[PDB]
Amino acid sequence: GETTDGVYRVMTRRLLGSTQVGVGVMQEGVFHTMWHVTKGAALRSGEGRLDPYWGDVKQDLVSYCGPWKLDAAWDGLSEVQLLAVPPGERAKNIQTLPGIFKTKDGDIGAVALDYPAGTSGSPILDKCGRVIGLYGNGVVIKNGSYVSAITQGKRE
Amino acid sequence: DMYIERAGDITWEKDAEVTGNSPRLDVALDESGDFSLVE
Ligand SMILES: O=C(c1csc([C@H]2CCCNC2)n1)N1CC[C@H](c2cccnc2)C1
């Protein structure tokens, strides 16, 4: 059904009324979201069906209808924008300068923005509106605040 | 079943709310996709 490019809310009717479980990005006819939102399950768009194509639990990423299409990355210097789509609230752009997640397998950018669990999947954008990653997989630091990684997939 | 609903365009918007610090955290990533803090 509806396949128009843009940011989408991932909902369900399994619990009390409608409940927002996460967010995703539609791009080039491919729905990109985080694995923990759908756990790999199929989706409904209008009267259509979005069946999974690629997914990975370590990366926490899943693409529907086709392979992962988002391939831009943070330059390590510029400020970025979390286009955060919160549950029950309207989409809202928040600008910030990401920090770093120092790992044994390389550095990754990280946004220090706290949002309710259903915001998971919301894109992180560069100065051209290019998707450089998704928000929703991170850690809780010493003072209690939440720092989410800029999770990006690989284009094939 | 789960379903999707449009929420907006993917565009950079000038004069947006600027907040959030930039920390350097030593972290680990487990086989289950969980991020741990290393200390
Ligand atoms: O990063 C999050 C997350 C995003 S917003 C969110 C909540 C947490 C409390 C305050 N902020 C709101 N939690 N996950 C960690 C646990 C979970 C998971 C499990 C297995 C693999 N990856 C991820 C999601």
Side-chain angles (χ1 to χ4, degrees):
Chain A
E2 180 184 13
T3 55
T4 279
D5 249 53
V7 70
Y8 282 69
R9 304 184 191 270
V10 181
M11 311 287 300
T12 181
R13 298 206 167 108
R14 194 193 73 120
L15 282 92
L16 197 90
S18 310
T19 302
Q20 185 172 302
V21 286
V23 173
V25 175
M26 183 77 63
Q27 185 170 113
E28 306 179 30
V30 172
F31 194 64
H32 305 77
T33 194
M34 309 213 76
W35 186 95
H36 77 260
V37 179
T38 73
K39 301 258 181 306
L43 310 171
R44 170 175 50 89
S45 189
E47 210 174 1
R49 185 175 167 128
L50 300 187
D51 286 288
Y53 178 113
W54 170 71
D56 188 303
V57 159
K58 193 185 212 274
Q59 291 181 70
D60 197 24
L61 296 159
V62 62
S63 62
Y64 294 72
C65 314
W68 190 272
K69 296 272 208 267
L70 320 178
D71 61 339
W74 180 52
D75 58 357
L77 299 180
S78 329
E79 274 199 342
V80 301
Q81 266 184 26
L82 168 62
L83 164 51
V85 179
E89 309 161 15
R90 178 156 56 247
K92 183 190 49 169
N93 299 50
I94 307 289
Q95 200 175 313
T96 186
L97 180 85
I100 298 295
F101 269 9
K102 296 182 183 166
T103 86
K104 72 184 193 267
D105 296 326
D107 296 2
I108 314 115
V111 293
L113 291 170
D114 217 338
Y115 279 90
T119 309
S120 274
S122 304
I124 295 151
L125 333 166
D126 62 21
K127 301 179 193 179
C128 318
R130 273 179 281 129
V131 195
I132 55 164
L134 308 179
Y135 164 99
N137 189 28
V139 77
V140 169
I141 72 158
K142 236 210 171 188
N143 63 191
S145 190
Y146 176 75
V147 180
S148 168
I150 299 174
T151 305
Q152 176 70 290
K154 192 212 176 186
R155 215 223 171 93
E156 265 287 274
Chain B
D1 250 67
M2 293 185 174
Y3 67 92
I4 70 167
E5 270 187 15
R6 213 170 176 274
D9 295 355
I10 308 149
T11 59
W12 176 272
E13 301 293 298
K14 293 192 191 82
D15 291 318
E17 182 193 349
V18 198
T19 186
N21 71 300
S22 324
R24 286 182 194 254
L25 318 164
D26 263 280
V27 311
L29 179 63
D30 80 357
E31 187 190 299
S32 301
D34 293 300
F35 276 106
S36 318
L37 241 156
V38 182
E39 274 252 10

